[PDB]
Coordinates of C-alpha atoms (C1' of nucleotides) and ligand atoms in Angstrom, one line a residue:
Chain A
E1 CA -12.7 17.6 -14.8
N2 CA -11.8 14.9 -17.0
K3 CA -8.5 12.8 -16.1
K4 CA -6.6 9.9 -17.6
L5 CA -5.3 6.6 -16.0
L6 CA -2.0 5.8 -16.9
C7 CA -0.1 2.3 -16.2
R8 CA 1.3 2.9 -12.9
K9 CA 4.5 0.7 -14.0
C10 CA 5.3 2.2 -17.5
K11 CA 3.1 4.9 -17.3
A12 CA 1.5 4.2 -20.8
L13 CA -2.1 5.7 -21.1
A14 CA -4.4 3.4 -20.3
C15 CA -8.4 5.8 -20.9
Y16 CA -10.1 8.4 -19.3
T17 CA -12.1 8.6 -16.6
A18 CA -14.8 9.6 -19.3
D19 CA -14.9 6.0 -20.1
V20 CA -15.6 4.4 -17.2
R21 CA -17.9 3.2 -15.7
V22 CA -19.5 1.5 -12.4
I23 CA -21.5 -1.5 -11.7
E24 CA -23.2 -2.5 -8.7
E25 CA -21.4 1.4 -7.1
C26 CA -18.6 -1.3 -6.6
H27 CA -16.7 -2.3 -9.7
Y28 CA -15.0 -0.4 -12.4
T29 CA -15.3 -1.3 -16.2
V30 CA -14.0 0.7 -19.5
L31 CA -15.8 1.2 -23.0
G32 CA -14.7 1.6 -26.3
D33 CA -12.2 -0.4 -28.5
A34 CA -9.3 1.7 -27.7
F35 CA -8.7 0.5 -24.5
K36 CA -9.0 -3.0 -25.6
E37 CA -5.9 -2.5 -27.7
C38 CA -4.2 -1.4 -24.4
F39 CA -4.4 -4.9 -22.4
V40 CA -3.9 -8.3 -22.9
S41 CA -6.0 -11.2 -21.5
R42 CA -5.0 -14.5 -19.9
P43 CA -7.4 -17.4 -18.7
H44 CA -7.8 -17.1 -14.8
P45 CA -5.9 -18.9 -13.1
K46 CA -8.6 -19.3 -10.4
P47 CA -11.7 -18.7 -12.3
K48 CA -15.2 -18.4 -10.4
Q49 CA -18.2 -17.0 -10.1
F50 CA -19.7 -14.3 -8.0
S51 CA -22.3 -11.6 -7.6
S52 CA -23.7 -10.6 -11.3
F53 CA -20.6 -12.2 -13.2
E54 CA -18.5 -14.8 -13.6
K55 CA -14.4 -14.0 -13.6
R56 CA -12.9 -15.9 -16.2
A57 CA -9.6 -13.8 -17.2
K58 CA -6.7 -12.0 -15.8
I59 CA -5.7 -8.4 -17.9
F60 CA -2.4 -7.2 -18.2
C61 CA -0.8 -3.8 -19.3
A62 CA 0.0 -4.5 -23.5
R63 CA 3.3 -2.9 -23.0
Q64 CA 5.9 -5.8 -23.5
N65 CA 8.3 -5.7 -20.9
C66 CA 5.8 -4.4 -18.5
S67 CA 2.5 -6.8 -18.4
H68 CA 1.6 -4.9 -15.3
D69 CA -1.6 -6.6 -13.4
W70 CA -4.3 -4.4 -14.3
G71 CA -7.4 -6.4 -13.5
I72 CA -9.6 -9.2 -14.7
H73 CA -12.5 -9.9 -17.3
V74 CA -15.7 -11.1 -16.7
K75 CA -19.2 -12.5 -18.1
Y76 CA -21.9 -9.8 -16.9
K77 CA -25.4 -10.3 -18.4
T78 CA -24.9 -10.8 -21.8
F79 CA -21.4 -9.0 -21.7
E80 CA -17.8 -10.1 -21.5
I81 CA -16.3 -6.9 -19.8
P82 CA -12.6 -5.9 -18.4
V83 CA -12.8 -4.8 -14.7
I84 CA -9.9 -3.0 -13.6
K85 CA -8.7 -2.1 -10.3
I86 CA -7.3 1.7 -9.8
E87 CA -4.2 0.6 -7.7
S88 CA -2.6 -0.6 -10.8
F89 CA -2.9 3.2 -12.8
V90 CA -2.0 6.8 -12.0
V91 CA -4.6 9.2 -12.4
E92 CA -3.4 12.9 -14.4
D93 CA -5.3 15.4 -14.0
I94 CA -5.6 16.5 -17.5
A95 CA -5.7 20.3 -17.6
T96 CA -2.7 20.7 -14.6
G97 CA -0.9 17.1 -15.1
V98 CA -1.1 16.8 -11.4
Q99 CA -0.8 13.0 -10.7
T100 CA -2.6 11.0 -8.0
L101 CA -1.9 7.5 -6.6
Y102 CA -5.1 5.9 -5.0
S103 CA -5.2 2.4 -3.8
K104 CA -9.0 1.9 -3.7
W105 CA -11.7 3.5 -5.5
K106 CA -13.7 4.7 -2.7
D107 CA -11.0 7.0 -2.0
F108 CA -10.8 8.5 -5.8
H109 CA -13.8 10.8 -6.3
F110 CA -15.1 11.5 -10.2
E111 CA -18.3 11.5 -12.0
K112 CA -18.8 7.8 -11.6
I113 CA -21.2 7.1 -14.3
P114 CA -23.0 3.6 -13.9
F115 CA -23.0 1.1 -16.4
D116 CA -25.5 1.2 -19.2
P117 CA -26.5 -1.9 -21.4
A118 CA -27.3 0.5 -24.0
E119 CA -24.1 1.7 -24.4
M120 CA -23.1 -1.8 -25.6
Chain B
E1 CA -12.9 13.5 26.9
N2 CA -12.0 10.3 29.0
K3 CA -13.0 7.0 27.4
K4 CA -11.9 3.3 28.1
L5 CA -10.1 0.5 26.3
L6 CA -11.3 -2.9 26.3
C7 CA -9.6 -6.2 25.1
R8 CA -11.0 -6.4 21.6
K9 CA -11.4 -10.0 22.2
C10 CA -13.1 -11.0 25.9
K11 CA -14.2 -7.2 25.7
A12 CA -12.3 -6.6 29.6
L13 CA -11.1 -3.3 30.7
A14 CA -7.8 -2.7 30.0
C15 CA -7.2 1.2 30.8
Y16 CA -8.5 4.5 30.1
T17 CA -7.2 7.2 27.8
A18 CA -6.2 9.3 30.7
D19 CA -3.5 6.6 31.3
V20 CA -2.5 6.8 28.1
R21 CA 0.7 8.5 27.5
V22 CA 2.6 9.3 23.7
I23 CA 6.1 8.7 22.6
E24 CA 7.8 10.3 20.0
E25 CA 4.6 11.3 18.6
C26 CA 4.0 7.6 17.3
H27 CA 4.2 4.8 20.1
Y28 CA 1.7 4.3 23.1
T29 CA 2.4 3.3 26.9
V30 CA -0.1 3.3 29.6
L31 CA 0.8 4.4 33.2
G32 CA -0.5 2.7 36.4
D33 CA 0.1 -0.2 38.4
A34 CA -3.7 -1.2 37.9
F35 CA -2.6 -1.8 34.0
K36 CA 0.3 -4.3 35.3
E37 CA -2.9 -6.5 36.5
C38 CA -4.4 -6.7 33.3
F39 CA -1.5 -8.2 30.9
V40 CA 1.2 -10.7 30.6
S41 CA 4.5 -10.8 29.1
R42 CA 6.8 -13.2 26.9
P43 CA 9.7 -12.8 25.9
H44 CA 9.8 -11.4 22.3
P45 CA 10.3 -13.6 19.4
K46 CA 11.5 -11.6 16.8
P47 CA 13.7 -8.5 19.3
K48 CA 15.0 -5.6 17.8
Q49 CA 16.0 -2.4 18.7
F50 CA 14.7 0.7 16.6
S51 CA 14.2 4.9 17.5
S52 CA 15.0 5.0 21.2
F53 CA 14.2 1.9 22.2
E54 CA 14.7 -2.0 22.8
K55 CA 11.8 -4.7 21.9
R56 CA 12.4 -7.3 25.0
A57 CA 8.7 -8.8 24.7
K58 CA 5.2 -9.3 23.7
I59 CA 2.2 -8.2 25.9
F60 CA -1.0 -10.6 26.0
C61 CA -4.3 -10.2 27.6
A62 CA -4.1 -11.8 31.3
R63 CA -7.5 -13.2 31.1
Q64 CA -7.0 -17.0 30.4
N65 CA -8.8 -18.5 27.3
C66 CA -8.1 -14.7 26.0
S67 CA -4.5 -14.0 26.1
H68 CA -5.3 -11.7 22.8
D69 CA -2.0 -9.6 21.9
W70 CA -1.9 -6.0 23.4
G71 CA 1.7 -5.0 21.5
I72 CA 5.3 -5.5 23.3
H73 CA 7.5 -4.3 26.1
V74 CA 10.9 -2.5 25.8
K75 CA 13.4 -0.9 27.1
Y76 CA 12.9 2.7 26.9
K77 CA 15.6 5.1 27.9
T78 CA 15.9 3.8 31.6
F79 CA 12.2 2.5 31.5
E80 CA 10.7 -0.8 31.1
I81 CA 7.1 -0.1 29.7
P82 CA 4.2 -2.1 27.6
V83 CA 3.5 -0.3 23.9
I84 CA 0.0 -1.4 22.9
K85 CA -1.6 -1.3 19.6
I86 CA -5.1 0.4 19.2
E87 CA -6.4 -2.3 17.1
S88 CA -6.0 -4.9 20.0
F89 CA -8.6 -3.0 22.0
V90 CA -12.4 -1.5 21.9
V91 CA -12.3 2.4 22.5
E92 CA -15.8 3.0 24.8
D93 CA -17.6 6.4 25.6
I94 CA -18.0 6.4 29.5
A95 CA -21.0 8.7 28.9
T96 CA -23.0 6.9 26.2
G97 CA -21.6 3.2 25.7
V98 CA -20.4 4.3 22.2
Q99 CA -18.1 1.5 21.1
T100 CA -15.4 2.2 18.4
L101 CA -12.8 0.0 16.6
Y102 CA -9.7 1.8 15.2
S103 CA -6.8 0.4 13.1
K104 CA -4.4 3.0 13.6
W105 CA -3.5 5.8 16.6
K106 CA -3.6 8.4 13.4
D107 CA -7.3 8.0 13.4
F108 CA -8.2 7.9 16.9
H109 CA -8.6 11.6 18.3
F110 CA -7.9 12.2 21.8
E111 CA -6.1 14.0 24.1
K112 CA -2.7 12.7 23.4
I113 CA -0.6 13.5 26.6
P114 CA 3.1 13.0 25.5
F115 CA 5.2 10.7 27.8
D116 CA 6.5 12.6 30.8
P117 CA 9.5 10.6 33.0
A118 CA 9.2 12.6 35.8
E119 CA 5.7 10.5 35.9
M120 CA 7.9 7.1 36.3
Chain C
rG1 C1' -13.0 -7.3 -8.7
rA2 C1' -15.1 -5.8 -3.8
rC3 C1' -14.3 -7.0 0.7
rG4 C1' -12.3 -9.8 5.0
rC5 C1' -8.4 -13.1 7.1
rU6 C1' -3.2 -15.8 8.2
rA7 C1' 1.9 -16.5 7.6
rG8 C1' 6.4 -14.6 6.3
rC9 C1' 9.7 -10.6 5.2
rG10 C1' 11.5 -5.5 5.2
rU11 C1' 12.7 -0.5 7.0
rC12 C1' 13.2 3.3 11.3
Chain D
rG1 C1' 5.5 -0.7 17.9
rA2 C1' 5.3 2.8 13.7
rC3 C1' 5.1 1.9 8.7
rG4 C1' 6.1 -0.6 4.0
rC5 C1' 5.9 -5.4 0.9
rU6 C1' 5.2 -10.3 -0.6
rA7 C1' 2.3 -15.5 -0.5
rG8 C1' -1.3 -18.1 0.7
rC9 C1' -7.0 -18.7 2.3
rG10 C1' -12.1 -17.4 2.7
rU11 C1' -16.7 -14.5 1.5
rC12 C1' -20.2 -12.2 -2.4
Ligands
ZN1 ZN1 2.4 -1.0 -18.3
ZN2 ZN1 -8.8 -10.3 26.9

RNA sequence: GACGCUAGCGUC
RNA sequence: GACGCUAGCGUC
């Protein structure tokens, strides 16, 4: 069932599992312009290249006074997208409100939709 | 089902699960004189007391050119005993030869006989 | 980011 | 030892 991700630090809404996409069964990104508003970016202090994408920026919660580290932003194929680490969020079940703290995506089981270039 | 612990680094036989005893359902020690031949000690650089015992020393694989860290030696009640961390070892099934690498005792499921002072 | 590794610190 | 938290390094 649908879930939302909240910033672990300030509990601000980040996105919904419906917006989440999986790349190479290993990396997690989020679609839509709404999410772009929820984080700010910063040139990565240790940028580098690996696999199918290059690491350009660190990303953080947009909430001033929070600035919680949410992960990175990368160039993947012809796209520049955010890649997030679940450890930076609280997962909340929308129907019940039950909150879950994961450390690894491997432990978080949901409909893991694979990334599709045709979604932009 | 009885199994043997091998030094993770040099693969030397250390003990059997038969010899293992649990203290406070959290800490693991080894009975018998045979095990006493398999490790050497060195005063603990960062001693301290906690729970029911006192940390006196570190213990290492007695094999020279190995000396893999196996855990500690403590005064517990009126006992001087070794306390081992499972991640310093490789578990081997005696019947099949299958080897398992655990990191935490909670993950290792064997007949965990609790410590009995009546056994020295 | 995913994973692996070293060092240090902290609690019982 | 059982947990917990930092920092750095490496790999793709
Ligand atoms: Zn936040
Ligand atoms: Zn050894």
